Nucleic acid binder design. Structure first.
Ligand SMILES: [Mn+2]
Ligand SMILES: [Mn+2]
Ligand SMILES: [Mn+2]
Length: 430
DNA sequence: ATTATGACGCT
DNA sequence: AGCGTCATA
């Protein structure tokens, strides 16, 4: 009764850019705006690999992971922008710099957690309290929430989509108790007002549109964000969770999209997140371990405690390249040439990082894949990173992997390498 | 022959 | 430390 924690202590948002690499290319090239468009890496193998897709192109069935030649079969007029190539490899610098643009704007509203190149979580709890205090019992007008969906509404006793959005919002605001500064529903609502402001600033100052979710924790914020993409934000209330989760496939929840999620389904013989409520915490711990079990027990009730970390910068800087099929590296000088290419890009990015962010990486991780290995990385070794010098770093990387060569004579490399990866880690202030 | 990343958890 | 899992453009 008075003691069950309801996980409504925080207001958390997740802001995620719409079709992000496409928007970066569309800002740069106005000819691509309002068109079926995709961003592609490489070209020679089946037209290149698609890694981002405009919403116009999604209507034709184009997706990420698609080869551009196959995408062209679905959408003949699909426009394509190519990822930059430098030193023999895809180079994602334009998108990393566009990301920084957005992260720096978000950081004006609150401390953010960078969660990917195109999204960040925001803990808005403190900001909400302050916006509430200067509101002074003022109701929140629908005009302050022009792009907001309230999940689960309208409901109960118009066939257009913007009309439905407003009816839901009206029901939500009609039910609110703006008199209570400690009311979670009110706090989420004010949270949504702030996120409209944040999203407006992002679009105003970069030209990029985004979506967002507002809830009481990260997992619900992430889920909410996706519910009404693109260019809209969604509020998922604590009260909306039972209905939402009652038909929500388990795999849809962040962290459950892989093997653990499949095991929850198989072991418990269930399909939907809501079905998890019928197991005791000990039961879930018994199958999925102490941490996962407790996490699942709270999550299916809409409760999660993972904090929004104060980290705006990536904590690693890495360079990697696959060498598929018959391009696998089979000679020493080949291996060394590509270690140098990767190292030169790493040096460039590292030197820029040091000047911008007052830190130095101290560890170099070197990873390779060998032909005939199922897994993504075959071998991972670390060595000291003491100087931002590409030739030193590549020479060092070679030294850590020299012995992986199974060939008798030194000139050949066997079995051939299908992946090289250099990653700088363990930053210290400088 | 989706590729190029990046964070977190386990032992 | 090195490996595995999960995630995102
Ligand atoms: Mn996105
Ligand atoms: Mn994203
Ligand atoms: Mn995506």
């Amino acid at each position: 009764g008075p003691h069950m924690a309801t996980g409504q202590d925080r207001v958390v948002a997740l802001v995620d850019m719409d079709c992000f690499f496409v928007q970066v290319e569309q800002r740069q090239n106005p000819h691509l705006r309002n068109k079926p468009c995709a961003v592609v890496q490489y070209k020679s193998w089946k037209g290149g690999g698609i890694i981002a897709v405009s919403y116009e192109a999604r209507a034709f069935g184009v997706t990420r992971s698609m080869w551009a030649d196959d995408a062209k079969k679905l959408c003949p007029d699909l426009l394509l922008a190519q990822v930059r190539e430098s030193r023999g490899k895809a180079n994602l610098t334009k998108y990393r710099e566009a990301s920084v643009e957005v992260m720096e704007i978000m950081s004006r509203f609150a401390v953010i957690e960078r969660a990917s190149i195109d999204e960040a979580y925001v803990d808005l709890t403190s900001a909400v309290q302050e916006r509430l205090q200067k509101l002074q019992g003022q109701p929140i007008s629908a005009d302050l929430l022009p792009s907001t969906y309230i999940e689960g509404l309208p409901q109960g006793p118009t066939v257009q989509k913007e009309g439905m959005r407003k009816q839901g919002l009206f029901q939500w605001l009609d039910s609110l108790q703006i008199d209570n500064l400690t009311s979670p529903d009110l706090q989420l609502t004010v949270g949504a007002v702030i996120v409209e402001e944040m999203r407006a600033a992002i679009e105003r100052e970069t030209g990029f549109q985004c979506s967002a979710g507002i809830s009481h924790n990260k997992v619900l914020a992430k889920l909410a964000c996706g519910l009404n993409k693109p260019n809209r934000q969604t509020l998922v209330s604590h009260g909306s969770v039972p209905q939402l989760f009652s038909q929500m496939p388990i795999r849809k929840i962040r962290s459950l999209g892989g093997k653990l999620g499949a095991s929850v389904i198989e072991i418990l013989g269930i399909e939907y997140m809501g079905e998890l409520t019928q197991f005791t915490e000990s039961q879930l711990q018994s199958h999925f371990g102490e941490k996962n079990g407790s996490w699942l027990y709270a999550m299916c009730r809409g409760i999660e405690h993972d904090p929004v970390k104060p980290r705006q910068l990536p904590k690693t800087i890495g360079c990697s390249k696959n060498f598929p099929g018959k391009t696998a590296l089979a000679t020493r000088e080949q291996v060394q040439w590509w270690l140098l290419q990767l190292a030169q890009e790493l040096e460039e990015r590292l030197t820029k990082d040091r000047n911008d962010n007052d830190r130095v990486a101290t560890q170099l991780v070197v990873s390779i894949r060998v032909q005939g290995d199922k897994r993504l990385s075959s071998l991972r070794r670390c060595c000291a990173l003491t100087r931002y010098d590409a030739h030193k770093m590549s020479h060092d990387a070679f030294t850590v992997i020299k012995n992986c060569n199974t060939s008798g004579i030194q000139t050949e490399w066997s079995p051939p390498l299908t992946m090289l990866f250099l990653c700088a880690t363990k930053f210290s202030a400088s």
